[PDB]
Each structure stands twice: as structure tokens, then as C-alpha cells.
């Protein structure tokens, strides 16, 4: 059975996480974890509860990791204990990914030192402290690193990760079990697609979880250049 | 506050509905609930555990209602005190919207009688026998009903919601935090643009399913026929 894991932490935003978990669930001879420190509930930054499977020392050896984003991402870019997890399971996965801004927390685990990724538009400018080079696409791919942007990249790389862990019959059949075929009612999903007004009010929104970050960063870039 | 309320039964397909609640989670002035029999764990089809935070009883008047699918479906379209919630938050809320075969619960409820609506692919031949006037699109507006096909049309319609609660700008604010702009690598998300050895597969899986639901469908339509 392939073993696939998401990292599931206090204030994930779980769009992230539960769009590629339905996803890759439905494929045959998988089975899905979701880890944190300890068995038993999770709160997403929306309130919502999810209940996390499994530990990290109890955790099988994955073949594919997914770091999802969310408010919590900063307190993760400083747990020396799950970045010391992602290490350890990343070296010997056949895939390492993550979702909008789980990149950060690949960045701050050493992960991103000279590999093109990209993460979320607002917070873009944190990569190359990390030793990332960095790419405006939405779906970034160096070697064995997957990083994606936007809430349901990973619904995307998931179909993905189907047709080369299985074919493309089997995603394409996953994708029509799925019904699957968006089509969003506006076309503000960029920042280049936005009206300008629209930018604006999300950039202020933003500014001050981004000064935190910016804080975050560079503690994290300074203990690997240690 | 708005008040948006979103059914959480066992054997629910967990996509259908933590779509739209994480897109609709981050407006402003918004209450959104998980409904059940009681406050507690509820298992989604794919193992993953959710919890619920209110019972039938102590819901609020709800502004939205949402049914998601999945395969515990055909147990909700015969379950009586589910079926008279629907029906007395439908009364008065301002949108009854549903996603793939929850429309077949808003069906038993009686509320598609009469109505435009649709459903997931495979299970379409059975909005007839409901009384509804069955149409082939993905997303399908009667009045207040908003009926959509896809493991995530409640992330599409929750945009469109959000422009008709509040305004376009916040729609689209909206979008650009979440860095909304899907791109699948496949193009089988319809029995139309899927290739047939692929519909033919998807087709062979449901059909337990299927001949399942049609019993249940026309016990349901005998009752609404009472």
C-alpha cells in the first residue's frame, strides 16, 4: 500500500489539507495519515475540528508528504520537532509536497536550499531568505519537490500524483467519479487577474501577519546557517 | 450575523462540504454550523472524523442551508427527522443549496417538486421520479435553490453567495486570499469529455450503488406521493 501523510497542526487552514485527502483516499491500495505529536483532535483556523491518526514516532515511512498551509505555519517554521519529522520523512519519499503556505515550513526545514518553489502571492518574498529560488507558477516541480498555490493545489497535484503513482486511466477515473470540472464565477484568483482595488484591501489585510513572518524567517534562515 | 448551516451525517463525502464552509468561513459576520442528531464525531466515507457542534434542535433559523453528498445518502433520503429539518429550515432560509447527490436528500424532502435542479452524473436518472425538471449543467438556480455537480461546486457557488450576501468586491477578496484559480491536469471531469473506456469503468463501479438508490428513490417518491 502506498503511504501518504499530511502534517495537521493547530490553525491549519484545512481546505488544504481535506481537498487532496478526498482526492487520494478514493485510489486504490492507499492509505492516508493524518500526523501530529500526538493522536486526537486538531483546530483549523476556521474552528473546524479534525482529529490527527497518527504520531510523528509511530508514523510509518511515507511515500509521498504534504505540508498544508494556514495561519499556524508560523509556529511550525520554529517547532524543532516537526521540522525535524518533515527531514526525516522527506529523504526517503518519492514525493515531498505542500500547499500554498506549507512552503515556508519545507523553506524553514532546509528543504528549499538552491530548488525553485513557489508559495502564497502575499508572502512570495519570504523564499529566498529560505535558500529557494523563486517561481510565480502555480505548480512549481524540482526533482521530487512538489510546491503548489492556491487553497486546492493539492486537489490538482493530486491527479497528478494518481497518473504517476498509478496511470492516467485511473486519475482520469478518479476525476470523473469525482465529477470534478471548477469553473469559479470571478477571475480574481491572482494578483494579476484582481482588480487593483481588490489587491490593495488584501495586501493590508495581510501586512501584519506578514511583518510576523518576516520576523519568523530570518530566525529560522540564521539556524541554517548554523 | 448570517447563519449558514451545513448537514454532517455519517458516510458524507467530507470535500462536498469542507469546501464551501472554509470559502464561506472567511467572510465577515458569518456563523456557520455543523448539524446533526447531536454535537459529536461524524465519520466521512474516507475515514476521515469531523465533528458536529449542534443538534436539529438548537440550530438557529439559518440563512443557508447545504446539503453535501456521498455515500450515506440513501440512508438520510429515509431518515424521517432528517428529512422534516430540511424541510423547516428550508421554509424560511434564503438559499437551499446542495452539492453531487445531496440534492437527492433536498429530493425526499420534497423539495425539488417542480424544480430545476441536478445531481452527480452517474445518479441522474433519479431526479425524475422526485419530481424535479432534471437539467444536465453544473451549477442549476430555481428561486432559492441552488443545486451544483462536483466535489467542489459549494467552493464555485460559495463565491457566488458571498457576491449576493455582501458584494462582488468582497467575492473577489475573498478569492485572492485563498489564491482561487484551479487548473486540472486532466479533462475527465464530465462523461462528455472523459474517454468512454474511462465512463465505462466509472459507470461499472456505481452501478451497485445505483440499483441501490433506485429502490430507495421510489420508497421516497411513494411517500411524497402520500
Not at 494518481?162 to 478518479?174: G, I, S
Amino acid at each position: 500500500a502506498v503511504q501518504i501523510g499530511f502534517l495537521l497542526f493547530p490553525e491549519v487552514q484545512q481546505l488544504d489539507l481535506t481537498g487532496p485527502h478526498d482526492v487520494l483516499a478514493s485510489l486504490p491500495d492507499v492509505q492516508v495519515h493524518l500526523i501530529w505529536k500526538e493522536p486526537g483532535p486538531v483546530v483549523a483556523s476556521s474552528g473546524l475540528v479534525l482529529q490527527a491518526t497518527t504520531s510523528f514516532a509511530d508514523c510509518p515511512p511515507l511515500d509521498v508528504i504534504c505540508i498544508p498551509g494556514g495561519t499556524g505555519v508560523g509556529a511550525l517554521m520554529e517547532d524543532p520537532q516537526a521540522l525535524a519529522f518533515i527531514r526525516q520523512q522527506a529523504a526517503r519519499a518519492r514525493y515531498v509536497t505542500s500547499v500554498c503556505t506549507g512552503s515556508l515550513v519545507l523553506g524553514a526545514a532546509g528543504l528549499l536550499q538552491g530548488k525553485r518553489a513557489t508559495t502564497h502571492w502575499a508572502y512570495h518574498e519570504l523564499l529566498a531568505p529560505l535558500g529557494a529560488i523563486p517561481v510565480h507558477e502555480r505548480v512549481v516541480r524540482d526533482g521530487n519537490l512538489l510546491t503548489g498555490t492556491g487553497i486546492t493545489a493539492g486537489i490538482d497535484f493530486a491527479l497528478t500524483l494518481a497518473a504517476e503513482l498509478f496511470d492516467a486511466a485511473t486519475a482520469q477515473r478518479v476525476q470523473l467519479q469525482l465529477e470534478y470540472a471548477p469553473a469559479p464565477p470571478f477571475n480574481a484568483g491572482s494578483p494579476d487577474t484582481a482588480p487593483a482595488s481588490v489587491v490593495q484591501q488584501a495586501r493590508q489585510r495581510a501586512a501584519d501577519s506578514l511583518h510576523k513572518r518576516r520576523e519568523i524567517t530570518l530566525r529560522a534562515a540564521a539556524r541554517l546557517a548554523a
